[PDB]
Ligand binder design. Sequence first.
Ligand SMILES: Cc1ncc(C[n+]2csc(CCOP(=O)(O)OP(=O)(O)O)c2C)c(N)n1
Ligand SMILES: Cc1ncc(C[n+]2csc(CCOP(=O)(O)OP(=O)(O)O)c2C)c(N)n1
Ligand SMILES: CCCCCCCCO[C@@H]1[C@@H](O)[C@H](O)[C@@H](CO)O[C@H]1O
Ligand SMILES: CCCCCCCCO[C@@H]1[C@@H](O)[C@H](O)[C@@H](CO)O[C@H]1O
Ligand SMILES: CCCCCCCCO[C@@H]1[C@@H](O)[C@H](O)[C@@H](CO)O[C@H]1O
Ligand SMILES: CCCCCCCCO[C@@H]1[C@@H](O)[C@H](O)[C@@H](CO)O[C@H]1O
Ligand SMILES: CCCCCCCCO[C@@H]1[C@@H](O)[C@H](O)[C@@H](CO)O[C@H]1O
Ligand SMILES: CCCCCCCCO[C@@H]1[C@@H](O)[C@H](O)[C@@H](CO)O[C@H]1O
Ligand SMILES: CCCCCCCCO[C@@H]1[C@@H](O)[C@H](O)[C@@H](CO)O[C@H]1O
Ligand SMILES: CCCCCCCCO[C@@H]1[C@@H](O)[C@H](O)[C@@H](CO)O[C@H]1O
Ligand SMILES: CCCCCCCCO[C@@H]1[C@@H](O)[C@H](O)[C@@H](CO)O[C@H]1O
Ligand SMILES: CCCCCCCCO[C@@H]1[C@@H](O)[C@H](O)[C@@H](CO)O[C@H]1O
Lengths: 183, 186
Amino acid sequence: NKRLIILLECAIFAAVAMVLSFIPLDIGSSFSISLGMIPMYVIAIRRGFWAAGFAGLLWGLLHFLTGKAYILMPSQAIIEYILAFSFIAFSGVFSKQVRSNLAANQLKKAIEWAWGTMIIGGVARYFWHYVAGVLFWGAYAFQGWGAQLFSIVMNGASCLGTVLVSGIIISILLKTSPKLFLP
Amino acid sequence: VMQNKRLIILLECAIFAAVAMVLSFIPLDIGSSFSISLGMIPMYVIAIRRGFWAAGFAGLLWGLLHFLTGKAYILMPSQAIIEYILAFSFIAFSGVFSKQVRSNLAANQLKKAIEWAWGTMIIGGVARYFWHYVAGVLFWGAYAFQGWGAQLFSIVMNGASCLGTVLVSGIIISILLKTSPKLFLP
Ligand SMILES: Cc1ncc(C[n+]2csc(CCOP(=O)(O)OP(=O)(O)O)c2C)c(N)n1
Ligand SMILES: Cc1ncc(C[n+]2csc(CCOP(=O)(O)OP(=O)(O)O)c2C)c(N)n1
Ligand SMILES: CCCCCCCCO[C@@H]1[C@@H](O)[C@H](O)[C@@H](CO)O[C@H]1O
Ligand SMILES: CCCCCCCCO[C@@H]1[C@@H](O)[C@H](O)[C@@H](CO)O[C@H]1O
Ligand SMILES: CCCCCCCCO[C@@H]1[C@@H](O)[C@H](O)[C@@H](CO)O[C@H]1O
Ligand SMILES: CCCCCCCCO[C@@H]1[C@@H](O)[C@H](O)[C@@H](CO)O[C@H]1O
Ligand SMILES: CCCCCCCCO[C@@H]1[C@@H](O)[C@H](O)[C@@H](CO)O[C@H]1O
Ligand SMILES: CCCCCCCCO[C@@H]1[C@@H](O)[C@H](O)[C@@H](CO)O[C@H]1O
Ligand SMILES: CCCCCCCCO[C@@H]1[C@@H](O)[C@H](O)[C@@H](CO)O[C@H]1O
Ligand SMILES: CCCCCCCCO[C@@H]1[C@@H](O)[C@H](O)[C@@H](CO)O[C@H]1O
Ligand SMILES: CCCCCCCCO[C@@H]1[C@@H](O)[C@H](O)[C@@H](CO)O[C@H]1O
Ligand SMILES: CCCCCCCCO[C@@H]1[C@@H](O)[C@H](O)[C@@H](CO)O[C@H]1O
């Protein structure tokens, strides 16, 4: 029953996220808007912290199976497609608050809590992308840029752009489809 | 080779992950739901020595090594994922107070260094055993005592396992801060 259902929902939203990953919003190899965070955000709100991590990791592991995983070195694939996607769990730190306000028709308060949990969950993921950027992606930097500088700026931009476009759509989905976040 | 700081830190993570995997072959278990993980001792050293991200990388390496060495108890593909990848990745939080420990240890403030160390060891331990508790509820409900639900059995057993692990590992680390300060100070 419930155990199978919650696990399946994680797998479904992971699959949807993997599908959205085939929609390229990239500028080079260091900037990209991850539309797959949209299914991650709803499942994080709908089910909570642990579910967002499991679903997130499934999404990361699906990169390997679908061949969408950039692999410079074995270490870097471990950090970027497993560690980083596991910390999507933090997208559900305010899931109870969002669901609480959403069910009580406090949509404004629900959206505000939603942006709080989408930013934390976003930064939590891209932290590991920033780490791997310094360790592995130095040779892709601009002319005269260090590995750390190139990593914080590019991963910061990717994080900023990703949370922004996903946050807006989530906000609309909170307005248009409340039951999607309320199981 | 020793001038490449990035390669060294990665190697150190691999080394401590290997040492933790060896300690995982030391059975301090009572049944299948209680165990004192001695492998958290090297995980705590590297966490203090190198910080948050290194602890998570080393922890995950330790977690993955369970598959290669056949030490992973796999009930379902989804629980193996949660317990040997998610749980071991959250050992990163063993390094939330790494700077404080090293800062006090270098200033010869041993008492304060140990106090921060215990804080960073408790948080890191809880961060890992959270996922063991989650999997305990989701999967390990059939190994419970008679009359015990999945929730009850998981919070008590994983709580005790976490308690026993943090206590034993914490004391060993506390002594190593006294006897071997340079081990935590790169
Ligand atoms: C400076 C820098 N450049 C490039 C990378 C590589 N990188 C950034 S995000 C990422 C994860 C995949 O990104 P994306 O194309 O958004 O995958 P999605 O989640 O959308 O499926 C990787 C491998 C990095 N970690 N750091
Ligand atoms: C109630 C419950 N019982 C059993 C488990 C299974 N379990 C607990 S901790 C753990 C990780 C391995 O722990 P340990 O036995 O200490 O191995 P080691 O740390 O030495 O590698 C697993 C698979 C669980 N998650 N929940
Ligand atoms: C279509 C999307 C509209 C934008 C929605 C986000 C604007 C609301 O912004 C709120 C703040 O007003 C509030 O003070 C803090 C509290 O921590 O959290 C934010 O989400
Ligand atoms: C959202 C963030 C956008 C950041 C864009 C930064 C553009 C970098 O632009 C760099 C310069 O900084 C550098 O000095 C010269 C050297 O030949 O080459 C360029 O590519
Ligand atoms: C669509 C782009 C805008 C939505 C994102 C805004 C992020 C939340 O920003 C809020 C602020 O609005 C607020 O003033 C302070 C006060 O504690 O805390 C922040 O979290
Ligand atoms: C204060 C006591 C801490 C816990 C001690 C754990 C004892 C470890 O020793 C156990 C044995 O007690 C057990 O019989 C076999 C097989 O089940 O495996 C061993 O690991
Ligand atoms: C002394 C430290 C705390 C341990 C107290 C209880 C240990 C026994 O707990 C066992 C479990 O470990 C075992 O997996 C299941 C199997 O069905 O049955 C229980 O009796
Ligand atoms: C050999 C075993 C030594 C055990 C030493 C335990 C020290 C506990 O350390 C605590 C800290 O964890 C706590 O945060 C602060 C708060 O003010 O106070 C200390 O006593
Ligand atoms: C083996 C001994 C382990 C000791 C670990 C202690 C960790 C908790 O540390 C607590 C603090 O968190 C608390 O603020 C103060 C207040 O009185 O007291 C300490 O014992
Ligand atoms: C050893 C570490 C123990 C951690 C226990 C976590 C305490 C919170 O417990 C809640 C549960 O009560 C709840 O069923 C779900 C979320 O709705 O998961 C946890 O977050
Ligand atoms: C920290 C160590 C905790 C160990 C707890 C062990 C609980 C024992 O479990 C008993 C069962 O063995 C007994 O058969 C039934 C009776 O119907 O009730 C339980 O309390
Ligand atoms: C690893 C876990 C170690 C066991 C718990 C350590 C106890 C610290 O907990 C302290 C107590 O010692 C203190 O008496 C009161 C404050 O009035 O509450 C806590 O702050």
